[model samples]
Target: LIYTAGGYFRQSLSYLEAYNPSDGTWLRLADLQVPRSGLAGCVVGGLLYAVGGRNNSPDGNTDSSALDCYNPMTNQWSPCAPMSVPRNRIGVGVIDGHIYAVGGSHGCIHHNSVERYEPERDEWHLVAPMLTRRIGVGVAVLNRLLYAVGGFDGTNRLNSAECYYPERNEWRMITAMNTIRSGAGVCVLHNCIYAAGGYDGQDQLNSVERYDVATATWTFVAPMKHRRSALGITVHQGRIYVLGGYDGHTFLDSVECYDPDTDTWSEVTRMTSGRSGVGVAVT
Candidate 1:
């Protein structure tokens, strides 16, 4: 089963839905307590957690610090302790049994601050944070370390990438992506991390890149059929699924899949509704 929550369309959303690949169907589940856009979400201890993001409001400071959790067994939502800082367009990765909230925004302002949530303690604490502020960043946990991929930092779209050390609580620079990417979809396949389709400063992109952390090098891969940004990405049964995003013109419902073995891509079925930069987890 694949579960996803919180994304933007005409407005922010609280829709929580699950995709059953075996049946090719979607089932509605509990909603987040508060509707939000760009909220970061992750599965910890077999439970779903939705973290900070923007309220569907014009005020930047109105960014939400709210945190919510869902239990599959009960089909209900629960409130958890909130982060001290308000965040929107944040990225999330689960490592060492904790959820790390990465770079986000305070509307006009971008953030480099990182926070870790401990479900046992029902609290969040600071990490060293990223070296550069970012929103719409792609996050993946590989080799027990968290990787924050390229994103817009308010002033500019980024080609730079950063790696964080959970043991030392610090971040360091890595070789950048071949293309500047904001709102790219990212996933870890075997030892490599793939960053797909995003907006550069000038245009939506169809290009994708593979980052071999061991090699510390990036290489071009087959591009998606459409130029897109802020897409949803997840790996299911060894295949990467990249779904609904913003093209240069409008919201998209196109879904594509990548097979790392053959170094290929193919179209998958689209989502019922288009979603961008949202939280998705294989449960």
Candidate 2:
């Protein structure tokens, strides 16, 4: 799998290619359109879609409505229709050939604005917003349903979760997670949703939780090898991978992988730079 890196401030805006299964080898690729942090990405029709983010500081965290698509065939980038409202730190998903982007930060307020993109028409239409505003929420799609996990509001970190049904064009709140976190990442595996590594204000976390969508309940799974926040996590080939994030004062380059069958976490290859607020999408 390949993961892209962005600049929060002075850090370089470059894409770093990663080998599958935490092999540790990396190759630098072309940079992004601008320096962005806390953006959301998803791959659809063999193309990469990057949306919304900003530079390092809160002032730089302005919501971006731009939707950029990368075509690996031509090795180029193009603009898709922008979102109706601008936001950063959003969660992205594509189902049944339609792009759905949800939750992010707007001004000093966290947002629940949701929108859908039709690549065929190159347009965006507003969808039903969530019940609560959040940023740094973990998202996973299973059986056409999108589940949103813990995130940070202006004051408190949320342990809450929600699910969206496109067929109904509505949102329904699900069981809350055990750990309150934001800036975490998630993946869907074997009908369960697993979320790992995020901040709890006092510290970055290695705690992992799995949600039973059928029961609409959450259970503590396994903790990560390392405690980190604002990291990027993805599942591929039946394995789970966690990537670059921060440990309070310092940024980290370390990586880890979890084997659900074995129920254990192991160290992977380290990244080139210290980063948090990163994004990942797999084909």
Candidate 3:
């Protein structure tokens, strides 16, 4: 199942939907308990967990720590253990059975704090924070290690990157990315971590780059045709799929795919509606 949660549809929304690739159809699911944007989510133990996001609804707060879980078997949503710290635009990743929520802003101030959630214990524990305070950072796990990629550090967009080793429970600076960006989509693919389209402070971007795990280096790759930010990205087979996001002027519905083997990006199908700050998950 391919799931997308709360996003802006001209206005903040809590709409939930699942894409059925088998029939090329989308089926609406239960709405989120709170309407939000800039949300993050991850799948663990067959359940989808929606994490911290910004509530942009009229008269609503700016950010949230509301954690909601969805069970496809029951097609319903239920509240889960919320983050100890409420934040928006955080990065989420699963390592072993634990979910790590990385740096994000609170009240517009970037944060270096990291939090860990244990579903078995229904609790959240603080971990070593990143070296740099940031929001909109992208987190990806490879070899049981967590990597926090490029994002906004409040004062400016950042190119710095860092990695956390579970054994040491510490974060250390790594080779920075070639691009200074925030709200980019990132995922581990074929032993490399790819960072694609995001905002670079001044404008939206189309550039994409990959981090070599073995060499701890970043190399630029073929760029997307459309400049975008706050996009949703996932790995399918050997290709990276980038979905809807903002293109500076408008919310986007365009979708594209990158074939690392070919070192190229191809325009794919589009989503039904334009969206940014949306959640993407595979189950």
Best by lDDT: 3
Clashing pairs in 1: none
Ranking by TM-score: 3, 1, 2
Which stretches in model 2 have alpha-carbon errors above 4 Å? 7-12, 22-24, 57-61
lDDT of each: 0.84, 0.77, 0.86
lDDT of 3 by residue, 1-283 (tens): 5788887767677878776555657788888878888888789899998889888865766788878899988988898888877778889989998999998878967889998999988889999988998788988998999999989888888888899999999998999898897999989888988899888889899999989888888998999999999988877667787888998898887878898879888876677788998878888
Q: Which stretches of candidate 3 lie over 4 Å from their true place?
A: 21-23
Candidates in order, TM-scores: namely: 0.95, 0.92, 0.96
Which is superior by lDDT, 2 or 3? 3
How large an RMSD does model 1 have? 1.7
**How does residue 60 of candidate 2 score in lDDT?**
50
